C-alpha cells in the first residue's frame, strides 16, 4: 500500500508532494514523483509564484508552471496551484513601484485574473493568499498591506473566484497548528473574507515543524476543527519535520511519530481533505537553505530510500507496517 492509496482508503482526497522544475532532470526522482500509489497530488514549489509568472507588469510567462501542471495531468494527480499573493518571491516592479490603492489594486486583480484564467479548471485548490500574519497574529507588512490595507485579502479571493469558480480558494500559513494568537487571526481572516461577501473554501496548515514540537493528535484535531467549524475545508499543505543535524535513531523515530500524528489528525477530522509534504526526499528539501543547521526533514533520504517516517505516515493512515 502506498501513501495515496492509504489516504484515499481513509476518506482523504489525496496524499501528495511539492516538486520544482530543476528536479525534473533527475530520472530516479521523477520515476518516484510519478508513482501514483504514493503521490495523488502535486504542488509547484516555485514556478506559479508572481516573480515566475509576471516578471514585468502585464507580461505573463507560464512555460515553467505549465511543465508542473502537465506532469500532474499526465499522471492523473490533482494540482494545488501555489501561490497568488505573498510577501516573498515578488518581482521588483511590484515591491519598488510608485503605487496608489487604486493602481496596486488593479495590478493585483490583473495578476490574479491572468494566472487563474490560464490554469482555469486545472487547479483543485489555489493558495490565494499566503502568510499574511506575523507570529503574534497582527498583519505581516508587505506592499499590498501598506498600499491597499487588509482589503487586499478579500480583493484577492474575489478576483480568483471570478476567474475560476471551480477552484477551492485557500488561505495558507504556518504555525497555525499551535492554536493561540496566530490561529485566532487566521480564523479572523476567514471571517473578514466572509464579511466582505467574497469566497473562501479552505485553510492550509503548512505543517513546517522542528522535530519534537508537534502536539498530540487530539490537540491537532481540535485546531483543525476550529477551522472546519467556520465552514471551510482544511489540508496540511507543506509538511516537513526538520532535525538539527546530525540525525540519530532517536530523532528519526521522533520524526516518524510527528508525521504519524499529523496525518492521523487529518484522517480523524471531517473536512480535512488531504496531506502534502514539501517535496518527498531530503535531496531536494528547502530546509537546509532556510533553517541553518537543520535538515533530513522528509520521509525519503537523499538516496531516495525510505526513512522510518514513511512507515509512520502509513501507521497514521491505519496501515499495518
Ligand atoms: C513522469 O510523468 C510525466 C507525466 O505523465 C511524463 O511526462 C514523464 O515522462 C514521466 N517521467 C518518468 C521518468 O516516468
Ligand atoms: C483601498 O480601497 C478599498 C476599496 O475601497 C478599501 O476597502 C480599502 O480600505 C482601501 N485602503 C486604503 C489604505 O485606503
Ligand atoms: K478527513
Ligand atoms: K527544492
TrEMBL record:
One of its GO terms (cellular component) is extracellular region. Disulfide bonds join 81-123, 266-272. It catalyses: Endohydrolysis of (1->4)-beta-D-xylosidic linkages in xylans. Pathway: Glycan degradation; xylan degradation. It comes from the Eukaryota. GO terms for biological process: xylan catabolic process. Residues 6-316 form the GH10 domain. Its main location: secreted. Glycans are attached at residues 34, 101. It is found in: Secreted. Its EC number is 3.2.1.8. It is an enzyme of class 3 (hydrolase). The keyword Nucleotide-binding does not apply. Keywords: Carbohydrate metabolism, Disulfide bond, Glycosidase, Hydrolase, Polysaccharide degradation, Secreted, Signal, Xylan degradation. GO terms for molecular function: cellulose binding; endo-1,4-beta-xylanase activity. Belongs to the glycosyl hydrolase 10 (cellulase F) family. Endo-1,4-mannanase, a crucial enzyme for depolymerization of seed galactomannans and wood galactoglucomannans. This is Beta-xylanase.
Amino acid at each position: 500500500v502506498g501513501l495515496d492509496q492509504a489516504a484515499v482508503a481513509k476518506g482523504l482526497q489525496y496524499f501528495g508532494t511539492a516538486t520544482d522544475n530543476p528536479e525534473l532532470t533527475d530520472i530516479p526522482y521523477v520515476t518516484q514523483l510519478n508513482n501514483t500509489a504514493d503521490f495523488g497530488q502535486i504542488t509547484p514549489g516555485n514556478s506559479m509564484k508572481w516573480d515566475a509568472t509576471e516578471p514585468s507588469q502585464g507580461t505573463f510567462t507560464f512555460t515553467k508552471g505549465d511543465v508542473i501542471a502537465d506532469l500532474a495531468e499526465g499522471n492523473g494527480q490533482y494540482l494545488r496551484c501555489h501561490t497568488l499573493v505573498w510577501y516573498n518571491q515578488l518581482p521588483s516592479w511590484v515591491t519598488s513601484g510608485t503605487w496608489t490603492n487604486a493602481t496596486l489594486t488593479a495590478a493585483l486583480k490583473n495578476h490574479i485574473t491572468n494566472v487563474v484564467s490560464h490554469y482555469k479548471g486545472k487547479c483543485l485548490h489555489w493558495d490565494v493568499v499566503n502568510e499574511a500574519l506575523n507570529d503574534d497574529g497582527t498583519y505581516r507588512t508587505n506592499i499590498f498591506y501598506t498600499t491597499i490595507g487588509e482589503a487586499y485579502i478579500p480583493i484577492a479571493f474575489a478576483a480568483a473566484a471570478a476567474a475560476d469558480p471551480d477552484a477551492k480558494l485557500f488561505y495558507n500559513d504556518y504555525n497555525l497548528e499551535y492554536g493561540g494568537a496566530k490561529a485566532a487571526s487566521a480564523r479572523a481572516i476567514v471571517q473578514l473574507v466572509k464579511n466582505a461577501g467574497a469566497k473562501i473554501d479552505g485553510v492550509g496548515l503548512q505543517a513546517h515543524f522542528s522535530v519534537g514540537t508537534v502536539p498530540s493528535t487530539s490537540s491537532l484535531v481540535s485546531v483543525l476543527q476550529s477551522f472546519t467549524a467556520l465552514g471551510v475545508e482544511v489540508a496540511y499543505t507543506e509538511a516537513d519535520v526538520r532535525i538539527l543535524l546530525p540525525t540519530t535513531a532517536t530523532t528519526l523515530a521522533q520524526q516518524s511519530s510527528d508525521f504519524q500524528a499529523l496525518v492521523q489528525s487529518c484522517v480523524q477530522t471531517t473536512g480535512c481533505v488531504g496531506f502534502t509534504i514539501w517535496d518527498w526526499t531530503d535531496k531536494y528539501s528547502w530546509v537546509p537553505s532556510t533553517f541553518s543547521g537543520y535538515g533530513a526533514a522528509l520521509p525519503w533520504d537523499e538516496n531516495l530510500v525510505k526513512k522510518p517516517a514513511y512507515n509512520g505516515l502509513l501507521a497514521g493512515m491505519g496501515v499495518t507496517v
